[PDB]
Structures are given as structure tokens and as C-alpha cells.
């Protein structure tokens, strides 16, 4: 399924940090493109753990989930790097970064209108998936990368890509899907097999409190012990300062995963706003 790139033409960079079992690297591939010219192109390179081989078949099926499709709004894979020693993804480069940094870093510079284009992009993109009955399982604003940011001049909005899930949490241990609450959704935390097209909208819910809430992350003053309590007493997230979609993300983190709202439904509230 996926296209092998030689690693003469695969120079690693600088480190961009590391995700789960994986590290992350800037990259530069040298490729012929369109009419046979000579590219060097910028990539992201992520490698998974040389300490955890167990789950490159999740690994690279996560990858593959992304690339079977092709929307506006999904990264790129480009392919897979031909090393034997390692396992290694080569994807688009989205120029700005995750949008949980973009968010804390510009805190006060983001009105309503910035969230809002923001999250009906998100909901585009989580509506396609679910249209192709296809779960991501890893829904939030770090993995949501900025392609570019508003422009002012124009008028011009942002642009808002997905990445591609990573490793299952199907197969993750425990103590990585606690960390993950609220993200991961009840039901998955007492069953990881109860991954659903409905994770999905919970995590969706998740990602709007992180969009609103400038770059914090929801329950982290609460350590694993308590995140699980926090899911036994029912307990949802406190509103965000900017309210306009503490509504909506009440919805759809409702602990009946059948009672949270179809995506076309969210774009309707979304689309509901000034
Ligand atoms: N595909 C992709 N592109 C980028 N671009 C990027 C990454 C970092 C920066 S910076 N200056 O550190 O803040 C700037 C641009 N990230 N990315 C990812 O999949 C990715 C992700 F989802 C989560 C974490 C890290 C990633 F790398």
C-alpha cells in the first residue's frame, strides 16, 4: 500500500519532539516531481521507538487509515523509508505546527471567529471520516496542524489539516490511555474494544474545550488516578471563558457515546453562530 523511499534521499533535521513510542524529525527528500524536475522537498520524519517494534503494525496501519482517502483537510503521506533497521513514516510538513502551540503562543490574538473557522474545518474533516465509517481514535489540537495562519490583509482565514492518528489505542497500554484523559472517552478507558465511530465526536468535544481554552490542557492538574474518578463521578469539563461553545462541547462529550450528535448535526450548531 505504500510507496518505499530510499534513504539517500532522506536527510534527517532537527527534532521536533517525540510522539507516542516515536520520535520526530524535520526532514529534507530529494525527489523527481512534476515534468521530471529535481525537488528538495521538506518532510516529517517520524520513527518509531527502536524500544518498542512491538506495534509497527499498528504503527503504519494508522498511517495507511489516512492515505486510502485523500481530503483537503488530511496530512499527506508521502511513503515509508526503506532502512530494514527501522521503521520510519514520511509525511507532509505543515508549515506552522501543531495548534495547540499556535493557540498558547497566541493566547489573546485569537477572537471567536479564529476558533470557530477552526473547529467547522475540524468538524469537515471528522464528518468526511464518518461519511467512510472510519474512526481516527487520536482526535486533538496536537494533532491538528496549522498549513497557514489568517491573513489579515485579505481577510483570509486559516488553514487547518489533520494528522494521522498513530499508534491504536487498542493496543496501547493502560497507563497511556488514562494519561490521554479526557481525550479518550469513557467507554474506551473500561473497554479499549469499545473504539467507535462515536470516540470520535468525544474527542471532538475534547479538542473544542483545547480550542477555546488557549493552548491548557483539559485535567491536567489531575494525575492518572484521578482522571479515572473523574469518568466514575460523571464529571464534565468547566465551561471555557469563551462560553459560545460550551454547549456544544457538553454534547458531544455526553457519557451515552449513542446520544452524541452526528458531525453533520455539529457543522448545523457551528454554522448556528453570528
Ligand atoms: N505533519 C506535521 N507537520 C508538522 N509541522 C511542524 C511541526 C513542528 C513545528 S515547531 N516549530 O516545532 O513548532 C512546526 C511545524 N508537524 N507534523 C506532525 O505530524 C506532528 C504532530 F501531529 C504532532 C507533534 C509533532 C508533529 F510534528
Redesign the pocket.
Given at each position: 500500500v505504500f510507496h518505499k523511499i530510499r534513504n539517500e534521499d532522506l536527510i534527517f533535521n532537527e527534532s521536533?519532539?517525540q510522539?507516542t513510542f516515536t520520535k520526530?524529525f524535520?526532514g529534507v527528500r530529494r525527489e523527481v516531481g512534476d515534468y521530471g524536475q529535481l525537488h528538495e522537498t521538506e518532510v516529517?520524519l517520524?520513527v518509531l521507538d527502536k524500544a518498542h517494534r512491538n506495534y509497527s503494525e499498528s504503527f503504519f496501519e494508522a498511517a495507511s487509515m489516512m492515505s486510502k482517502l485523500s481530503h483537503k483537510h488530511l496530512?499527506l503521506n508521502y511513503g515509508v523509508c526503506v532502512c530494514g533497521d527501522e521503521n520510519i513514516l514520511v509525511?507532509?510538513?505543515?508549515?506552522?505546527?501543531?495548534l495547540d502551540?499556535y493557540l498558547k503562543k497566541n493566547k489573546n490574538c485569537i477572537n471567536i471567529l479564529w476558533k470557530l473557522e477552526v473547529a467547522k474545518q475540524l468538524a469537515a474533516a471528522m464528518h468526511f471520516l464518518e461519511e467512510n465509517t472510519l474512526i481516527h481514535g487520536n482526535v486533538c489540537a496536537?494533532?491538528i496542524?496549522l498549513i497557514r495562519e489568517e491573513d489579515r490583509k485579505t481577510g483570509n482565514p486559516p488553514f487547518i489539516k489533520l494528522?494521522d492518528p498513530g499508534i491504536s489505542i487498542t493496543v496501547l497500554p493502560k497507563d497511556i490511555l488514562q494519561e490521554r484523559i479526557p481525550w479518550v472517552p469513557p467507554e474506551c478507558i473500561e473497554n479499549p474494544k469499545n473504539l467507535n465511530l462515536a470516540t470520535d465526536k468525544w474527542s471532538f468535544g475534547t479538542t473544542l474545550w483545547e480550542i477555546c481554552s488557549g493552548g491548557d490542557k483539559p485535567l491536567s492538574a489531575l494525575d492518572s488516578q484521578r482522571k479515572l474518578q473523574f469518568y466514575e463521578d460523571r464529571h464534565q469539563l468547566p465551561a471555557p471563558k469563551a462560553a459560545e461553545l460550551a454547549n456544544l462541547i457538553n454534547n458531544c462529550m455526553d457519557y451515552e457515546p449513542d446520544h452524541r450528535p452526528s458531525f453533520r448535526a455539529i457543522i448545523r450548531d457551528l454554522n448556528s453562530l453570528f
Amino acid at each position: 500500500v505504500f510507496h518505499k523511499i530510499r534513504n539517500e534521499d532522506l536527510i534527517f533535521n532537527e527534532s521536533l519532539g517525540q510522539g507516542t513510542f516515536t520520535k520526530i524529525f524535520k526532514g529534507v527528500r530529494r525527489e523527481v516531481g512534476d515534468y521530471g524536475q529535481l525537488h528538495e522537498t521538506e518532510v516529517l520524519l517520524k520513527v518509531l521507538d527502536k524500544a518498542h517494534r512491538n506495534y509497527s503494525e499498528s504503527f503504519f496501519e494508522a498511517a495507511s487509515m489516512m492515505s486510502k482517502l485523500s481530503h483537503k483537510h488530511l496530512v499527506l503521506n508521502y511513503g515509508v523509508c526503506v532502512c530494514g533497521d527501522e521503521n520510519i513514516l514520511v509525511q507532509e510538513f505543515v508549515k506552522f505546527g501543531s495548534l495547540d502551540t499556535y493557540l498558547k503562543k497566541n493566547k489573546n490574538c485569537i477572537n471567536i471567529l479564529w476558533k470557530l473557522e477552526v473547529a467547522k474545518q475540524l468538524a469537515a474533516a471528522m464528518h468526511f471520516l464518518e461519511e467512510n465509517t472510519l474512526i481516527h481514535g487520536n482526535v486533538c489540537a496536537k494533532n491538528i496542524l496549522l498549513i497557514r495562519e489568517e491573513d489579515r490583509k485579505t481577510g483570509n482565514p486559516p488553514f487547518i489539516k489533520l494528522s494521522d492518528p498513530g499508534i491504536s489505542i487498542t493496543v496501547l497500554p493502560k497507563d497511556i490511555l488514562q494519561e490521554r484523559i479526557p481525550w479518550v472517552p469513557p467507554e474506551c478507558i473500561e473497554n479499549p474494544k469499545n473504539l467507535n465511530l462515536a470516540t470520535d465526536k468525544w474527542s471532538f468535544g475534547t479538542t473544542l474545550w483545547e480550542i477555546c481554552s488557549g493552548g491548557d490542557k483539559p485535567l491536567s492538574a489531575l494525575d492518572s488516578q484521578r482522571k479515572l474518578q473523574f469518568y466514575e463521578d460523571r464529571h464534565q469539563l468547566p465551561a471555557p471563558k469563551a462560553a459560545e461553545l460550551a454547549n456544544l462541547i457538553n454534547n458531544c462529550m455526553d457519557y451515552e457515546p449513542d446520544h452524541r450528535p452526528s458531525f453533520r448535526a455539529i457543522i448545523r450548531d457551528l454554522n448556528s453562530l453570528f
